[PDB]
Short mmCIF file of all heavy atoms in Angstrom, two decimals:
data_model
loop_
_atom_site.label_atom_id
_atom_site.label_comp_id
_atom_site.label_asym_id
_atom_site.label_seq_id
_atom_site.Cartn_x
_atom_site.Cartn_y
_atom_site.Cartn_z
N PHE B 17 31.34 -57.08 -60.02
CA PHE B 17 31.39 -56.14 -61.12
C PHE B 17 32.69 -56.30 -61.90
O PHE B 17 33.72 -56.72 -61.38
CB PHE B 17 31.26 -54.71 -60.60
CG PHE B 17 29.90 -54.41 -60.04
CD1 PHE B 17 29.65 -54.56 -58.69
CD2 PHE B 17 28.88 -54.00 -60.87
CE1 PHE B 17 28.40 -54.29 -58.18
CE2 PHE B 17 27.63 -53.73 -60.36
CZ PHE B 17 27.39 -53.88 -59.02
N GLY B 22 33.79 -47.59 -60.19
CA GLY B 22 32.96 -46.93 -61.17
C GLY B 22 31.54 -46.86 -60.68
O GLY B 22 30.71 -46.15 -61.24
N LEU B 23 31.26 -47.60 -59.61
CA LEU B 23 29.95 -47.54 -58.99
C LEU B 23 29.73 -46.18 -58.33
O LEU B 23 30.62 -45.64 -57.67
CB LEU B 23 29.81 -48.65 -57.95
CG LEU B 23 29.94 -50.08 -58.48
CD1 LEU B 23 29.80 -51.08 -57.35
CD2 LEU B 23 28.92 -50.33 -59.56
N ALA B 24 28.54 -45.64 -58.52
CA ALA B 24 28.18 -44.33 -57.99
C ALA B 24 27.46 -44.49 -56.66
O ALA B 24 26.42 -45.15 -56.60
CB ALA B 24 27.31 -43.56 -58.98
N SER B 25 28.03 -43.91 -55.61
CA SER B 25 27.40 -43.97 -54.30
C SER B 25 26.06 -43.25 -54.32
O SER B 25 25.94 -42.16 -54.89
CB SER B 25 28.32 -43.36 -53.25
OG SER B 25 29.57 -44.02 -53.23
N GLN B 26 25.06 -43.86 -53.71
CA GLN B 26 23.70 -43.33 -53.68
C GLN B 26 23.28 -43.17 -52.23
O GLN B 26 22.63 -44.06 -51.67
CB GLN B 26 22.74 -44.23 -54.45
CG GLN B 26 23.05 -44.35 -55.93
CD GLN B 26 22.74 -43.07 -56.69
OE1 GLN B 26 22.05 -42.18 -56.20
NE2 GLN B 26 23.27 -42.97 -57.91
N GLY B 27 23.63 -42.04 -51.63
CA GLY B 27 23.21 -41.75 -50.27
C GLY B 27 23.67 -42.78 -49.27
O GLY B 27 24.84 -42.82 -48.88
N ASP B 28 22.74 -43.63 -48.83
CA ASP B 28 23.03 -44.67 -47.85
C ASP B 28 24.00 -45.70 -48.42
O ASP B 28 24.35 -45.64 -49.61
CB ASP B 28 21.75 -45.36 -47.39
CG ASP B 28 20.87 -45.76 -48.55
OD1 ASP B 28 21.19 -45.39 -49.70
OD2 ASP B 28 19.86 -46.45 -48.32
N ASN B 29 24.42 -46.66 -47.60
CA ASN B 29 25.48 -47.57 -48.00
C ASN B 29 25.01 -48.54 -49.07
O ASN B 29 24.89 -49.75 -48.82
CB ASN B 29 26.00 -48.33 -46.78
CG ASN B 29 24.90 -48.70 -45.82
OD1 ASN B 29 23.72 -48.64 -46.17
ND2 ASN B 29 25.27 -49.09 -44.61
N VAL B 30 24.72 -48.02 -50.26
CA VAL B 30 24.41 -48.82 -51.44
C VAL B 30 25.13 -48.21 -52.63
O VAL B 30 25.55 -47.05 -52.61
CB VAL B 30 22.90 -48.92 -51.72
CG1 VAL B 30 22.18 -49.60 -50.58
CG2 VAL B 30 22.32 -47.54 -51.98
N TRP B 31 25.27 -49.02 -53.68
CA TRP B 31 25.90 -48.60 -54.92
C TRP B 31 24.95 -48.85 -56.09
O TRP B 31 24.12 -49.76 -56.05
CB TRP B 31 27.21 -49.34 -55.17
CG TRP B 31 28.34 -48.84 -54.34
CD1 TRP B 31 29.18 -47.82 -54.64
CD2 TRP B 31 28.76 -49.35 -53.07
NE1 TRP B 31 30.10 -47.65 -53.64
CE2 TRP B 31 29.87 -48.58 -52.66
CE3 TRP B 31 28.32 -50.38 -52.24
CZ2 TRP B 31 30.53 -48.81 -51.46
CZ3 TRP B 31 28.97 -50.60 -51.05
CH2 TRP B 31 30.07 -49.82 -50.67
N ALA B 32 25.09 -48.03 -57.13
CA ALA B 32 24.28 -48.15 -58.33
C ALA B 32 25.18 -48.47 -59.51
O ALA B 32 26.17 -47.77 -59.74
CB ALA B 32 23.49 -46.87 -58.60
N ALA B 33 24.84 -49.52 -60.25
CA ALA B 33 25.61 -49.89 -61.43
C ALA B 33 25.46 -48.83 -62.51
O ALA B 33 24.39 -48.25 -62.70
CB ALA B 33 25.15 -51.24 -61.96
N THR B 34 26.55 -48.57 -63.23
CA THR B 34 26.56 -47.57 -64.29
C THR B 34 27.71 -47.88 -65.24
O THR B 34 28.27 -48.98 -65.21
CB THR B 34 26.69 -46.15 -63.70
OG1 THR B 34 26.88 -45.22 -64.77
CG2 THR B 34 27.86 -46.08 -62.75
N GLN B 35 28.06 -46.92 -66.08
CA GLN B 35 29.20 -47.07 -66.96
C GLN B 35 30.49 -47.21 -66.15
O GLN B 35 30.54 -46.90 -64.96
CB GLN B 35 29.31 -45.89 -67.92
CG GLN B 35 28.16 -45.79 -68.90
CD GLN B 35 28.04 -47.02 -69.78
OE1 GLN B 35 27.25 -47.92 -69.50
NE2 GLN B 35 28.84 -47.08 -70.84
N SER B 37 31.55 -49.71 -65.00
CA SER B 37 31.33 -50.76 -64.02
C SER B 37 30.79 -52.05 -64.61
O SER B 37 30.90 -53.09 -63.95
CB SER B 37 30.37 -50.28 -62.92
OG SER B 37 29.06 -50.11 -63.43
N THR C 4 20.91 -39.09 -68.24
CA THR C 4 20.54 -40.24 -67.42
C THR C 4 19.10 -40.06 -66.95
O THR C 4 18.70 -38.96 -66.56
CB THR C 4 21.48 -40.38 -66.23
OG1 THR C 4 22.84 -40.36 -66.69
CG2 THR C 4 21.23 -41.70 -65.52
N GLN C 5 18.32 -41.13 -67.02
CA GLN C 5 16.91 -41.08 -66.66
C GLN C 5 16.64 -41.92 -65.42
O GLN C 5 17.55 -42.51 -64.82
CB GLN C 5 16.07 -41.53 -67.85
CG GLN C 5 16.16 -40.60 -69.05
CD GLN C 5 15.14 -40.93 -70.11
OE1 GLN C 5 14.35 -41.86 -69.95
NE2 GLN C 5 15.15 -40.17 -71.20
N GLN C 6 15.37 -41.99 -65.03
CA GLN C 6 14.99 -42.66 -63.78
C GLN C 6 15.32 -44.15 -63.83
O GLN C 6 15.85 -44.71 -62.87
CB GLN C 6 13.51 -42.45 -63.50
CG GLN C 6 12.98 -43.24 -62.32
CD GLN C 6 13.66 -42.87 -61.02
OE1 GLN C 6 14.00 -41.71 -60.79
NE2 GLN C 6 13.88 -43.86 -60.16
N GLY C 7 15.00 -44.80 -64.95
CA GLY C 7 15.25 -46.22 -65.06
C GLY C 7 16.28 -46.56 -66.12
O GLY C 7 17.08 -45.70 -66.51
N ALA C 9 19.04 -47.71 -66.33
CA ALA C 9 20.43 -47.80 -65.87
C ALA C 9 21.44 -47.61 -67.00
O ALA C 9 22.52 -48.19 -66.98
CB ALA C 9 20.68 -49.14 -65.16
N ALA C 10 21.10 -46.78 -67.98
CA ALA C 10 21.99 -46.58 -69.12
C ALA C 10 21.78 -45.19 -69.71
O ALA C 10 20.66 -44.85 -70.11
CB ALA C 10 21.74 -47.65 -70.19
N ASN D 21 35.28 -36.49 -44.29
CA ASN D 21 34.24 -37.48 -44.53
C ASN D 21 34.72 -38.88 -44.17
O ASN D 21 33.97 -39.67 -43.58
CB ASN D 21 33.79 -37.44 -45.99
CG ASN D 21 32.85 -38.56 -46.33
OD1 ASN D 21 31.96 -38.90 -45.55
ND2 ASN D 21 33.03 -39.15 -47.50
N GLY D 30 29.51 -51.11 -43.57
CA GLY D 30 29.76 -51.30 -44.98
C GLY D 30 30.34 -50.07 -45.65
O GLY D 30 29.79 -49.57 -46.63
N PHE D 31 31.47 -49.58 -45.14
CA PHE D 31 32.06 -48.34 -45.62
C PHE D 31 33.48 -48.58 -46.13
O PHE D 31 34.23 -49.35 -45.54
CB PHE D 31 32.09 -47.28 -44.52
CG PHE D 31 32.68 -45.98 -44.96
CD1 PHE D 31 31.97 -45.12 -45.77
CD2 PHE D 31 33.95 -45.61 -44.55
CE1 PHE D 31 32.51 -43.92 -46.18
CE2 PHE D 31 34.50 -44.41 -44.96
CZ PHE D 31 33.78 -43.57 -45.77
N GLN D 58 37.57 -44.98 -54.17
CA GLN D 58 37.36 -45.67 -52.91
C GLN D 58 38.19 -46.94 -52.87
O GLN D 58 38.18 -47.72 -53.83
CB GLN D 58 35.89 -46.00 -52.70
CG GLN D 58 35.01 -44.79 -52.47
CD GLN D 58 33.57 -45.17 -52.23
OE1 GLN D 58 33.02 -46.01 -52.92
NE2 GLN D 58 32.96 -44.54 -51.23
N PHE D 60 38.63 -50.51 -51.96
CA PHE D 60 37.72 -51.61 -51.68
C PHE D 60 38.39 -52.77 -50.95
O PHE D 60 37.96 -53.92 -51.10
CB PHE D 60 37.06 -52.09 -52.97
CG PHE D 60 35.98 -51.20 -53.46
CD1 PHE D 60 36.25 -50.20 -54.38
CD2 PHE D 60 34.68 -51.34 -53.00
CE1 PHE D 60 35.25 -49.37 -54.83
CE2 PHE D 60 33.68 -50.51 -53.45
CZ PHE D 60 33.96 -49.53 -54.37
N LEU D 84 20.14 -55.64 -54.03
CA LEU D 84 18.87 -55.22 -53.46
C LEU D 84 18.03 -54.56 -54.55
O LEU D 84 18.56 -54.08 -55.55
CB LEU D 84 19.09 -54.23 -52.31
CG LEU D 84 20.17 -54.62 -51.31
CD1 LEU D 84 20.32 -53.54 -50.25
CD2 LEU D 84 19.86 -55.95 -50.67
N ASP D 86 14.77 -51.74 -55.25
CA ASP D 86 13.95 -50.66 -54.73
C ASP D 86 12.50 -50.86 -55.15
O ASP D 86 12.20 -51.60 -56.09
CB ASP D 86 14.47 -49.31 -55.23
CG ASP D 86 13.77 -48.14 -54.56
OD1 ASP D 86 14.08 -47.85 -53.38
OD2 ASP D 86 12.91 -47.51 -55.21
N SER D 90 14.24 -50.05 -59.26
CA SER D 90 15.67 -49.81 -59.30
C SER D 90 16.41 -50.94 -58.59
O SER D 90 15.89 -51.59 -57.68
CB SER D 90 16.01 -48.48 -58.64
OG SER D 90 15.27 -47.42 -59.23
N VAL D 91 17.65 -51.18 -59.02
CA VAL D 91 18.49 -52.23 -58.47
C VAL D 91 19.74 -51.58 -57.90
O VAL D 91 20.45 -50.85 -58.61
CB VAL D 91 18.86 -53.28 -59.53
CG1 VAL D 91 19.59 -54.43 -58.89
CG2 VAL D 91 17.62 -53.77 -60.25
N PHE D 92 20.02 -51.85 -56.63
CA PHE D 92 21.20 -51.33 -55.95
C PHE D 92 22.07 -52.49 -55.51
O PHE D 92 21.62 -53.64 -55.47
CB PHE D 92 20.83 -50.46 -54.74
CG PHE D 92 20.08 -49.21 -55.09
CD1 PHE D 92 19.33 -48.55 -54.14
CD2 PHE D 92 20.14 -48.68 -56.37
CE1 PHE D 92 18.64 -47.40 -54.46
CE2 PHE D 92 19.45 -47.53 -56.69
CZ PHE D 92 18.70 -46.89 -55.74
N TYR D 93 23.32 -52.19 -55.17
CA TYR D 93 24.27 -53.18 -54.70
C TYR D 93 24.96 -52.65 -53.45
O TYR D 93 25.43 -51.51 -53.43
CB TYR D 93 25.29 -53.51 -55.79
CG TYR D 93 24.64 -53.87 -57.10
CD1 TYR D 93 24.30 -52.89 -58.02
CD2 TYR D 93 24.37 -55.19 -57.43
CE1 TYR D 93 23.70 -53.21 -59.22
CE2 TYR D 93 23.78 -55.53 -58.63
CZ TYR D 93 23.45 -54.53 -59.52
OH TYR D 93 22.85 -54.85 -60.72
N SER D 94 25.01 -53.48 -52.41
CA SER D 94 25.50 -53.04 -51.11
C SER D 94 26.50 -54.05 -50.55
O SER D 94 26.53 -55.21 -50.95
CB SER D 94 24.36 -52.85 -50.11
OG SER D 94 24.86 -52.64 -48.81
N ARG D 95 27.31 -53.57 -49.61
CA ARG D 95 28.27 -54.40 -48.91
C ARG D 95 27.91 -54.66 -47.46
O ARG D 95 28.40 -55.62 -46.87
CB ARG D 95 29.67 -53.76 -48.97
CG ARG D 95 30.81 -54.67 -48.58
CD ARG D 95 31.02 -55.77 -49.59
NE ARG D 95 32.11 -56.66 -49.21
CZ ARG D 95 33.38 -56.47 -49.53
NH1 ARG D 95 33.76 -55.42 -50.24
NH2 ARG D 95 34.29 -57.34 -49.12
N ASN D 109 17.06 -54.58 -45.78
CA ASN D 109 18.12 -53.91 -45.04
C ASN D 109 17.52 -52.83 -44.14
O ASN D 109 16.30 -52.62 -44.10
CB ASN D 109 19.15 -53.32 -46.00
CG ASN D 109 18.55 -52.29 -46.92
OD1 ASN D 109 17.36 -52.32 -47.22
ND2 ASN D 109 19.38 -51.37 -47.40
N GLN D 111 17.39 -49.73 -44.35
CA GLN D 111 16.91 -48.52 -44.99
C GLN D 111 15.60 -48.70 -45.74
O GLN D 111 15.02 -47.70 -46.18
CB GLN D 111 17.97 -47.97 -45.95
CG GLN D 111 19.17 -47.32 -45.27
CD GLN D 111 20.02 -48.31 -44.50
OE1 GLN D 111 19.94 -49.52 -44.71
NE2 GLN D 111 20.85 -47.80 -43.60
N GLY D 112 15.12 -49.92 -45.89
CA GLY D 112 13.85 -50.14 -46.57
C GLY D 112 13.99 -50.58 -48.01
O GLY D 112 13.24 -50.12 -48.88
N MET D 113 14.93 -51.48 -48.28
CA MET D 113 15.13 -52.03 -49.61
C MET D 113 15.04 -53.55 -49.53
O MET D 113 15.65 -54.17 -48.65
CB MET D 113 16.49 -51.61 -50.18
CG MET D 113 16.66 -50.10 -50.28
SD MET D 113 18.27 -49.61 -50.91
CE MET D 113 18.12 -47.83 -50.85
N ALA E 39 25.14 -44.89 -41.19
CA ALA E 39 25.11 -45.00 -42.65
C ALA E 39 25.63 -43.71 -43.25
O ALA E 39 25.18 -42.62 -42.87
CB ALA E 39 23.69 -45.29 -43.14
N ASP E 40 26.56 -43.82 -44.20
CA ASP E 40 27.08 -42.64 -44.86
C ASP E 40 26.03 -42.04 -45.78
O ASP E 40 25.02 -42.66 -46.11
CB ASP E 40 28.35 -42.99 -45.64
CG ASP E 40 28.14 -44.16 -46.57
OD1 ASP E 40 27.05 -44.77 -46.54
OD2 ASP E 40 29.08 -44.48 -47.34
N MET E 41 26.26 -40.79 -46.18
CA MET E 41 25.34 -40.09 -47.06
C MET E 41 26.10 -39.47 -48.22
O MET E 41 27.25 -39.04 -48.09
CB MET E 41 24.57 -39.00 -46.30
CG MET E 41 25.43 -37.90 -45.72
SD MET E 41 24.45 -36.64 -44.88
CE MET E 41 23.67 -37.61 -43.60
N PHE E 42 25.44 -39.44 -49.38
CA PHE E 42 25.98 -38.84 -50.59
C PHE E 42 24.85 -38.14 -51.31
O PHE E 42 23.92 -38.80 -51.80
CB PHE E 42 26.63 -39.88 -51.51
CG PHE E 42 27.91 -40.45 -50.99
CD1 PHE E 42 27.91 -41.52 -50.12
CD2 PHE E 42 29.12 -39.92 -51.39
CE1 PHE E 42 29.10 -42.05 -49.65
CE2 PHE E 42 30.31 -40.45 -50.92
CZ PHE E 42 30.30 -41.51 -50.05
N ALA E 43 24.91 -36.81 -51.39
CA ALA E 43 23.83 -36.05 -52.01
C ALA E 43 24.12 -35.77 -53.49
O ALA E 43 23.37 -36.21 -54.37
CB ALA E 43 23.61 -34.74 -51.25
N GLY E 44 25.20 -35.04 -53.76
CA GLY E 44 25.52 -34.66 -55.12
C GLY E 44 26.81 -35.26 -55.63
O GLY E 44 26.83 -36.37 -56.16
N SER E 45 27.91 -34.51 -55.49
CA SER E 45 29.20 -34.94 -55.99
C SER E 45 29.70 -36.16 -55.22
O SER E 45 29.09 -36.62 -54.25
CB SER E 45 30.21 -33.80 -55.91
OG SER E 45 31.53 -34.28 -56.15
N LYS E 46 30.84 -36.69 -55.67
CA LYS E 46 31.40 -37.89 -55.07
C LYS E 46 31.87 -37.68 -53.64
O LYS E 46 32.01 -38.66 -52.90
CB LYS E 46 32.56 -38.41 -55.93
CG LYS E 46 32.19 -38.65 -57.38
CD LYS E 46 30.98 -39.57 -57.49
CE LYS E 46 30.54 -39.73 -58.94
NZ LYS E 46 29.33 -40.58 -59.06
N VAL E 47 32.12 -36.43 -53.23
CA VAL E 47 32.57 -36.18 -51.87
C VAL E 47 31.41 -36.39 -50.90
O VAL E 47 30.28 -35.95 -51.16
CB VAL E 47 33.15 -34.76 -51.75
CG1 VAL E 47 32.17 -33.73 -52.31
CG2 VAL E 47 33.50 -34.44 -50.31
N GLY E 48 31.68 -37.08 -49.80
CA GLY E 48 30.63 -37.40 -48.86
C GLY E 48 30.14 -36.18 -48.10
O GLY E 48 30.74 -35.11 -48.11
N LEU E 49 29.01 -36.36 -47.42
CA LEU E 49 28.37 -35.28 -46.66
C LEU E 49 28.16 -35.65 -45.20
O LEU E 49 27.33 -35.04 -44.53
CB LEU E 49 27.04 -34.89 -47.30
CG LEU E 49 27.09 -34.13 -48.63
CD1 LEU E 49 28.18 -33.07 -48.60
CD2 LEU E 49 27.28 -35.07 -49.81
N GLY E 50 28.89 -36.63 -44.70
CA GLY E 50 28.78 -37.03 -43.31
C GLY E 50 28.10 -38.38 -43.16
O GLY E 50 27.93 -39.14 -44.11
N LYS E 52 24.73 -40.35 -41.17
CA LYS E 52 23.48 -40.33 -40.43
C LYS E 52 23.37 -41.58 -39.57
O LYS E 52 24.10 -42.56 -39.77
CB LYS E 52 22.29 -40.25 -41.38
CG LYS E 52 22.12 -41.49 -42.24
CD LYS E 52 20.80 -41.45 -43.00
CE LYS E 52 20.70 -40.22 -43.87
NZ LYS E 52 21.80 -40.16 -44.87
#
Side-chain angles (χ1 to χ4, degrees):
Chain B
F17 292 94
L23 300 179
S25 303
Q26 296 290 344
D28 48 353
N29 38 15
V30 298
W31 284 273
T34 172
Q35 294 301 98
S37 68
Chain C
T4 309
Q5 295 190 0
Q6 173 62 36
Chain D
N21 173 41
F31 180 75
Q58 291 182 316
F60 283 93
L84 315 178
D86 188 76
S90 306
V91 187
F92 295 160
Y93 308 87
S94 171
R95 194 69 181 272
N109 61 334
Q111 286 67 17
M113 302 178 181
Chain E
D40 52 355
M41 63 179 61
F42 289 86
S45 168
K46 305 306 176 182
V47 52
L49 288 318
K52 66 171 58 59

